[PDB]
């Protein structure tokens, strides 16, 4: 069937521009999003120590 993605007209009123004005000017974007999704560093590194450890196979 259908789906129309990335197809949405803007708000264009008094208050909702302040959500798009604080975004560009003071960067509430790009740090709450992209500075937190990188860190996300505390997870365990899933590395195989190849001369000692070995991975799975199949019969």
């Amino acid at each position: 069937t259908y789906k129309y993605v990335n197809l949405r007209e803007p708000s264009m009123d008094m208050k909702s521009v302040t959500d798009r004005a604080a975004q560009t000017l003071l960067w509430t974007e790009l740090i709450r999003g992209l500075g937190m999704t990188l860190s996300y560093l505390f997870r365990e590194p899933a590395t195989i120590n190849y001369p000692f450890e070995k991975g799975p196979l199949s019969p």
Partner: protein, 80 residues
């Protein structure tokens, strides 16, 4: 012209904020009385040596004693 501030602040929100800092910066030094306190201090900073003068008859004011109430009062700042 009332939406002209609302069809450019939702269109190019960079230089709009510049003109607001172009404003509110020229006007206010002519407004608050905290200025001319800037002038009274910046003149009352002694760089050079205050050389005394010669008496002849008068004496309108200011005898030789420095700790006498003979000159002005800039000592409001220490009380400020």
């Amino acid at each position: 012209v009332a939406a002209f501030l609302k069809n450019v602040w939702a269109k190019e929100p960079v230089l709009v904020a510049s003109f607001a800092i172009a404003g509110l910066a020229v006007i206010l030094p002519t407004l608050s009385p905290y200025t001319k306190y800037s002038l009274m201090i910046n003149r009352a900073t002694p760089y050079n040596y205050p050389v005394p003068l010669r008496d002849d008859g008068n004496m309108p004011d200011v005898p030789s004693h420095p700790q006498d109430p003979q000159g002005p009062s800039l000592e409001w700042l220490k009380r400020l």
